[PDB]
Design a protein around this nucleic acid. Structure first.
Lengths: 54, 478
DNA sequence: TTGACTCGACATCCCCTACAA
DNA sequence: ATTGTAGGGATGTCGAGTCA
């Protein structure tokens, strides 16, 4: 996977309390992490667990 | 009017990503709902009489009367909640309703100003009685939960539609006509989950074949296209409950979920398991039994378009050239054709259809013909059933690790089965280089064809695997 | 207002010549 | 007299349009 603490921060916070704002954040973050794509296709449960550790 | 397979592929991907995020949002929100600080405040909203109504005594002669009491409780809760929730906001923008690909693409541009919603602020909101309808309902679930009733939070996830291939993709009252969030409550007496929408429709229903909550009418489905309805429970369960609310789940809804192909299903189930933090209860079984009944009461659809790629059912005319009718079966139904006079079709159960393959086709699945096999169908090419066939066991490699190869000096490996028993497949651009350098005995692997053989690697004896791998790891020094 | 059917454009699956150095 | 190199046919899917 391989994400910063600033993007995982924005993503835990949007996902948890402001999901209306998902749309632009995801456009951005998916554009900075090509591997994120194939990760999500191969290993969604990983991306989840990453988002849960809070 | 139509976009590139790149955009197609991006839309499908973004759909999965957006969905996973949404479903996580559900999980987290349902956590915030279980909050004990909230419970202690919310309990006192519910009179003891109402509480008693919410936990009726087991009634042996007629459980129905207990269910009836539970329903009366749920209505009294919905009313007193009407009173508790004082200031009901508007969604800043489209809320969690579905967005159009155009809107997404465009959302990059204007970074709309968004007040962040922390966890405290949610609790405080629910306690003050100030918020939008999503928060309102969420609070309602908190309330029931603080009364020790088994009350799920339901979320209708609206990721962008990945079946919309279009380039150009083209008010408020029609969006809010049906809810994104609502509540379920478990009736131990009648053994069913009761549906509760205390804020939008303000009804309580025991869904059989129809639900007031499933959006109907062209206008409501523009921003709400019902596909993934997720239930989160007290114990941090996560269960896909779509089948309750979709009248036509197996025809209409399946085309619009990621679950329509097999890869999709596997992905979705992975996500639900990631989100399902409890172990199977007996209620899970009562539900699954309900779902099976529903899936068996849906039946044959009323149109040809809904029988394309149907899971259980196929028109006689859509039976592939390589399929046959399983002996002694026949139509399970007929389909009247809208818009052609008198025209009728034979509908078969897919479970009554057998898939046949030629000899080569089976070989490409790693199978050869069983002794005394008859063919089931012809075209010059005889086709055979799966039970006409048998695994192919390739000859073992020798002591020196020689693999018996074909006329072209390779071994054909189209399936793990076709690796000899004492041998392994090592897939790597230099695996052939390696084996040649060690001058160990190997054999090129043909793993597939391009339309020409694709040589993806080597098949070598297992004892030689470590050696090859070392040579591979040190390939730069060769 | 809708579905059956048709069509569009994709997409997916199942060898040697000429010639300069 | 030679080394190097560019240049598969059916079936399925979705959008639009015509007909009923």
């Amino acid at each position: 996977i391989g994400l910063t603490v600033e993007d995982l921060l924005s993503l835990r916070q949007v996902v948890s309390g402001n999901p209306e704002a998902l749309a632009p954040l995801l456009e951005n973050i998916s554009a900075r992490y090509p591997q994120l794509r194939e990760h999500i296709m191969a290993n969604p449960e990983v991306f989840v667990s990453m988002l849960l550790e809070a | 009017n139509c976009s590139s397979n790149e955009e197609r592929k991006r839309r499908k991907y973004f759909h999965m990503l957006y969905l996973v995020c949404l479903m996580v949002h559900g999980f987290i929100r349902n956590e915030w709902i279980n909050s004990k600080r909230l419970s202690r405040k919310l309990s006192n909203l519910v009179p003891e009489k109402v509480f008693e109504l919410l936990h009726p005594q087991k009634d042996e002669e007629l459980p129905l009367r207990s269910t009836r009491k539970l329903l009366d409780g749920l209505k009294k809760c919905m009313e007193l909640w009407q009173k508790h929730w004082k200031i009901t906001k508007k969604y800043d923008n489209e809320g969690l309703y579905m967005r159009t690909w155009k809107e997404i693409e465009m959302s990059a541009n204007n970074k709309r100003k968004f007040k962040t919603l922390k966890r405290s602020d949610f609790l405080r909101a629910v306690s003050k009685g100030h918020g939008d309808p999503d928060i309102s309902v969420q609070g309602f679930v908190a309330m029931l939960r603080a009364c020790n009733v088994n009350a799920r939070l339901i979320m209708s996830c609206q990721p962008p539609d990945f079946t919309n291939m279009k380039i150009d993709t083209s008010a408020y009252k029609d969006m809010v006509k049906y809810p994104i969030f609502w509540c379920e409550v478990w009736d131990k007496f009648s053994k069913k989950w009761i549906t509760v929408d205390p804020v939008n429709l303000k009804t309580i229903e025991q869904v059989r074949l129809h639900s007031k909550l499933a959006p109907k009418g062209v206008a409501c489905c523009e921003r709400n296209m019902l596909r993934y309805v997720i239930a989160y429970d007290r114990k941090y369960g996560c269960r896909d409950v779509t089948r309750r609310y979709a009248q036509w789940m197996n025809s209409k809804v399946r085309k619009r979920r990621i679950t329509k192909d097999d890869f999709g299903e596997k992905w979705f189930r992975k996500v639900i398991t990631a989100l399902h933090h409890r172990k199977r209860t007996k209620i899970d079984d009562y539900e699954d039994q309900y779902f099976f009944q529903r899936d068996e009461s849906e039946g044959i659809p009323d149109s040809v378009q809904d029988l394309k790629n149907h899971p259980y059912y196929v028109l006689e005319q859509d039976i592939k050239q390589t399929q046959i009718v399983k002996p002694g079966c026949k139509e399970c139904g007929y389909l009247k054709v809208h818009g052609k006079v008198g025209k009728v079709l034979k509908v078969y159960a897919k479970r009554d259809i057998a898939d046949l393959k030629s000899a080569r086709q089976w070989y490409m699945n790693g199978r050869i013909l069983k002794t005394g096999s008859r063919c089931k169908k012809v075209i010059d090419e005889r086709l055979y059933s799966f039970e006409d066939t048998e695994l192919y066991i390739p000859p073992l490699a020798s002591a020196s690790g020689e693999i018996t190869k074909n006329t072209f000096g390779n071994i054909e490996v189209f399936a793990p089965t076709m690796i000899p028993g004492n041998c392994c497949l090592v897939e790597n651009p230099v695996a052939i280089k390696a084996a040649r350098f060690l001058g160990v005995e190997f054999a090129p692997a043909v793993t597939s064809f391009k339309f020409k053989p694709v040589l993806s690697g080597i098949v070598v004896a297992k004892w030689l695997r470590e050696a090859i791998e070392t040579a591979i790891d040190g390939i730069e020094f060769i």
